Structure formats: C-alpha cells, structure tokens
C-alpha cells in the first residue's frame, strides 16, 4: 500500500469574494516529508502553500497540519478574485540529500469562476381578467454561470406544470439568462393568491431566489346583484335594499332608478370585505309609502365595466 494523493474534485466552482476550499488527502503517512500546494505544473509552477516556511496570508488550513497524524491537506483560499482561477496541485515531497525531492502529485483541482443569478422578475398581464380564464406570467433571471439552472413555478403552495422555459445562449458565455412563461388559471378564490417563480443555482448553495406576482392585480371578480323588500314589522314602511355581492377590485358606482329615473335620495350604504378577498356593498333605504306601482332598479358599474342591473316591483 503506497501513498496516494487524493483530490476528490476535478473542477471546483467559486464566486468573487467568497472563500475556496481545495480538498486534498494522503493515504499513507510514510515516506516522511512535507506536502505543498502549487498552481500549474512544470518548473514554472507557483507556490501556493507551504507547511513550514513562507508567508501565505490568504491561505488557511482545514485541519491542524502540526499534528503528526493528520492526513488532510485541504486549504481554504479567501477572497477569491478572477486572478485566482487555475489548476491547483497537491504535492508530496520526500527527504533527499540536500534538497527534498517530489514524490507524488494529486491529479489537481481546477478552480473556476461562476456567478449568481439575479433576483427573478415576474411580470403579470397588463389588463385584468375574469375567473375561468387562463393568463400568462413571465419569469426572467440573468447573469449566472454555469448554464445549468432550475426554475420552478408555484401558485401559492402548489407547483405548476403548464409552462415553457428557455436558457440562453447555447454557446459559451460569461453570463446566461433564463426565461419562462407560465399559463395560470384564475379561480374565483384567487384575489389573495400569489404566483411564484423559484430559481435554483449551484452558486446560491441551498437557498433559491423567488420572484412573486400578486393575482389581485390580474383578476376582476364581477359582482352578483339582488334587490329586496322588507315590510317594517311595525309600521307602513318598506325597506328597500340592494345587494352587490363578491366583487373585485373595490371600484364601484351604484345608482338607483325610479321608473328609469335617477333618484339622488339619501341612502345608508356600507362596505364589507369577504374572507375570499372580494368585497360586498349594501345599499338600503326606507320609503314613506304614499299611495300612487313603482319599478325600482339597482344599477351597478363595476371597475369601468358595462352597467348591470336588477328590477324590483313595489
């Protein structure tokens, strides 16, 4: 069993400013002699770390080399800048007569530079749409390398699958871009819902990045209408009320028509919100019942849409 130089990672990715960990282990403790780190092969190679002699402010050992028994010669190089890219070799020396002679080299680890993607930007449709229609959202992120990236779409907690994604370019680039379009169906319960784009990349290390769009901005929930009469249990009065149910957004004009004529009369009307995020608008008034068949119309204009109405006979 002769000493071997183990370097698990053929290529190591790192990002500007971060620390790089170069992994190296030995299989045997003999022959006796130091282990050194170099960038490059041949006589022109650069000395990166030396156990005993030399000053290496940027290098820091993973384990305690001073311990007789240590077999791990992995090093951390801090504050990586683009000048640090290269192939780093782990090299064992044995004793000689005056000099030490090279005994065995690891196969080297390439230190390569990657880049984090940008915070994903999710854009919604420009105009609002009623429920039971599918709309499109887009997600983009850019500036990342390498090209391998993962993009997930969610509506609230549920992952969507009705999407297309492209990564660009195909060739070599300093930076790649990811673009995705998701088809999302609008349900009547969707006012409080969020569309999410999740970007996963090796340079992020566990923590993905998220772009969001609120569906509150994409949906119009048309209101439902009804008008009623209530005989005031004590007296010759009628309680006429108009019920504008489950609408979104909160932008509404409600007019009363008496035989097709606008009233202008005083009405006590209140606004309520529903758990589903939609709104309700109640509008009631009392009539002194004179004597002289009146058709009452409750006319509602929601969010700039065509007027809808309901008739009621007294």
């Amino acid at each position: 069993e002769e000493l071997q130089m183990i370097q698990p990672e053929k290529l190591l990715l790192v990002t500007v400013g971060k620390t790089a960990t170069l992994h190296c282990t030995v299989t045997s403790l003999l022959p006796v002699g130091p282990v050194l780190w170099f960038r490059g092969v041949g006589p022109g190679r650069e000395l990166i770390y030396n156990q005993k002699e030399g000053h290496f402010p940027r290098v820091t050992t993973v384990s305690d080399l001073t311990k007789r028994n240590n077999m791990d010669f992995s090093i951390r190089i801090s504050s990586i800048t683009p000048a640090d890219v290269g192939t780093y070799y782990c090299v064992k020396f044995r004793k000689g007569s005056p000099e030490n002679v090279e005994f065995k080299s690891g196969p080297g680890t390439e230190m390569a530079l990657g880049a984090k993607p940008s915070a994903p930007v999710v854009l919604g449709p420009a105009a609002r749409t009623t429920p039971e229609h599918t709309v499109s959202f887009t997600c983009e992120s850019h500036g990342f390398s390498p090209r391998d990236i993962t993009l997930k779409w969610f509506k609230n907690g549920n992952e969507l699958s009705d999407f297309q994604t492209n990564v660009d370019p195909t060739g070599q680039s300093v930076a790649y871009s990811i673009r995705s379009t998701a088809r999302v169906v609008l349900d009547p319960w969707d006012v409080r819902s969020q569309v999410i784009c999740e970007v996963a990349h090796v340079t992020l290390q566990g923590d993905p990045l998220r772009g969001t769009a609120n569906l509150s901005e994409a949906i119009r929930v048309p209101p439902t209408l009804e008008v009623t009469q209530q005989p005031m249990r004590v007296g010759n009065q009628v309680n006429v009320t108009c019920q504008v149910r489950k609408f979104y957004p909160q932008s509404l004009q409600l007019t009363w028509s008496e035989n097709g004529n606008v009233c202008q009369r005083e009405t006590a009307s209140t606004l309520t919100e529903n758990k589903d995020g939609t709104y309700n608008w109640t509008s009631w008034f009392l009539v002194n019942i004179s004597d002289q068949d009146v058709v009452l119309t409750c006319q509602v204009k929601h969010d700039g849409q065509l007027a809808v109405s309901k008739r009621l006979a007294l």
Epitope: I6, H23, D72
Partner: antibody, heavy 119, light 108 residues
Framework: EVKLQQSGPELVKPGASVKISCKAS????????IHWVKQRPGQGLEWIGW????????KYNEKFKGKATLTADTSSSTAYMQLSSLTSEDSAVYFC????????????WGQGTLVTVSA | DIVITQSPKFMSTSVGDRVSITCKAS??????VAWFQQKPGQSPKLLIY???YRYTGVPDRFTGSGSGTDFTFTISSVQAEDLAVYYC?????????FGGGTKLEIKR
C-alpha cells in the same frame, strides 16, 4: 477484504431524527473518503455528501443542507449519517460507499439501510 | 448541478448480443465519468471509472468510452446475469450526479 456493514432498517416518526451507521473493516479507516448515497424506492441515486474521517472534514449536496449531518468515529472505524426532521420524502435506502483511486470514486459499498418515515 | 441524461431507459436483448448505453452531460466533464451496475436487491457496483477504465475484477465484456459531453457503456456479449439497472455518473464537479438508469432485460 474491504467491508462496509451498515446498521438495520429504521422506522421513524415524521418530524423525528435518526442516525444510520456504517462500520468499516479490512482497511485503514482514517485514510479514505466515505460517501453517502440516497435511493428513493424504484427511483435513481443521489449523492448526499462525504466525510473524510481523521479530519472529520465534510462536504454536502446542498439539497441535503439541514437534512443530513455526516460524522466519523475513527477509533470505532464507524461512519454516521444523521437525518433530521424526517418527512415522507426521506423514505429511502441509504448507502455508504468508500472512495478509491485519486478522485475517491464510489468503489466499495455498504448493503444499504432502509429508512421508512411513517406514523 | 450537472444533468446526465441516459439512453435508453429500457432495453431488452438476447444472450450474446452486443449492447450500448449512451450518456450525455450538460457540461464538458472531461473523462470524469463512472458506470455502475445495480442488480435487484443489491447495492450498486462500480464497473467503469474515468470513462474507460475497468475496476478490480470486472469481466472483459464491459467497456466504457467517450470524452467531453458524450459517453458510451457497452456489453460485448450480454449474459443472463447481466440484467440490472445501469447508471452513469459524473464525477467531475460537486454535487456529483447520476443518470436516470437503463434497465436491461433479456430476450429469451
């Protein structure tokens, strides 16, 4: 000969933790990388991470960030993997493998340990 | 995370036929590829490493080749014990990643 014998099958409550073990023999234990690998029943393989015993240096697949913790007891020639806050996504066979040649390739494998996460 | 896509997912073959599984990486992974064999009930077995080298006592009939983004695993003469799932793996960059498997079945 080079042997890796892992501990028996596990049944763990959702949300609980467990510690599989992998006892090594017939080689100098401090000297080689140990890797763990995951296999979800009838699915593929996934590298979880490594530990170099002797240094205790570990490196993880970020997918298993706060899920797995690798350790080694050199005196007992044994390697451990702890799995925290188990969901049904963790139900799988887990293997330990020992590295070989200059890249620590997955060359010597344990028999696997079935972990079932259920109530 | 490098993706390895492996073809075909299923293959059926007579005893003594020649077969070839291909494996494609999303990056240039040099020759840092391994091939494993997993028979039902068992752990994976290292067959090929560094894309073409046979491992301690693996039969003559198992060969590997390829460099860069394309790799080939080949059985020269399929034997009945050779039914299993075969995986390629990149051993180039962390996190190390495996292909999806090729299930080999025997025509008889």
């Amino acid at each position: 000969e080079v042997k890796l014998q892992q501990s028996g099958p596990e049944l763990v409550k959702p949300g609980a933790s467990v510690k599989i073990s992998c006892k090594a023999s017939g080689y100098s234990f401090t000297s080689y990388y140990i890797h763990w690998v995951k296999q979800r029943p009838g699915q593929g393989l996934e590298w979880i991470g490594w530990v170099f015993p002797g240094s205790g240096n570990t490196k993880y697949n970020e997918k298993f960030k706060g899920k797995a913790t690798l350790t080694a007891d050199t005196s007992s020639s044994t390697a451990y993997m702890q799995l925290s806050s188990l969901t049904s996504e963790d139900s799988a066979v887990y293997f330990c493998a020992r590295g070989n040649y200059d890249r620590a390739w997955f060359a010597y494998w344990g028999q696997g340990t079935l972990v079932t996460v259920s109530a | 995370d490098i993706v390895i896509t492996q073809s075909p997912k299923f293959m059926s073959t007579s005893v003594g036929d020649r077969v070839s599984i291909t494996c494609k990486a999303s990056q240039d992974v040099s020759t840092a590829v391994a091939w494993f064999q997993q028979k039902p009930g068992q752990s994976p077995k290292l067959l090929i490493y560094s894309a073409s080298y046979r491992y301690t006592g693996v039969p003559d009939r198992f060969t590997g080749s390829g460099s860069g983004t394309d790799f080939t695993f080949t059985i020269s003469s399929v034997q009945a014990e050779d039914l299993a799932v075969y995986y390629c793996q990149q051993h180039y960059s962390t996190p190390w990643t495996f292909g999806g498997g090729t299930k080999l079945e025997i025509k008889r």
